[PDB]
Design a binder for this molecule. Sequence first.
Ligand code: HEM
Ligand SMILES: [Cl-]
Ligand SMILES: [Cl-]
Ligand SMILES: [Cl-]
Ligand SMILES: [Cl-]
Ligand SMILES: [Cl-]
Length: 152
Amino acid sequence: AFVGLSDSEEKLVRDAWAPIHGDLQGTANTVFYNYLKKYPSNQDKFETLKGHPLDEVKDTANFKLIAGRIFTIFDNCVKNVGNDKGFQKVIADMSGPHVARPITHGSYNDLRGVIYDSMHLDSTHGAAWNKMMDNFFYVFYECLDGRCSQFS
Ligand code: HEM
Ligand SMILES: [Cl-]
Ligand SMILES: [Cl-]
Ligand SMILES: [Cl-]
Ligand SMILES: [Cl-]
Ligand SMILES: [Cl-]
């Protein structure tokens, strides 16, 4: 279920994200690369990347666009962390493009974990971050299951 964050938890999330917020595209490029490398089945899901070596596509425009758009969504979720409707809306809007797609929960969760590992958070900040991401996934998966308009 969706579980709101306190004012203090919101602050924790914003602080946890600040290093990424301040280097958003550069972090996105690295994290997205590490994700595709560690979990090689996922590159094929990206039609613009499909059929080429990872190391061939990593410094291309299409690759950086994809990495950037994932991170832009999380940056906006963080923006909206103190507004559950606003937060849900960011997710609602990005969910439609995924609904029809053959992407497993495993794949999305593997990406969440690459992000987590990259942030090297202490347990206090990690707890708050995971509250947010649990909300993120709750909303996203409700929307993938065709129960998106409950957030409207
Ligand atoms: C969970 C965090 C994710 C976020 C924030 C996110 C965000 C986005 C955004 C903003 C778009 C652009 C809308 C469009 O042009 O279609 C998009 C499209 C898409 N995403 Fe995601 N995404 C996530 C996870 C994933 C994962 C894990 C995969 C594949 C393993 C994936 C595969 C795709 C594909 C195939 C498209 C369609 C456009 C395209 O062909 O690339 N997404 N995503
Ligand atoms: Cl894999
Ligand atoms: Cl490869
Ligand atoms: Cl994506
Ligand atoms: Cl607000
Ligand atoms: Cl920390």
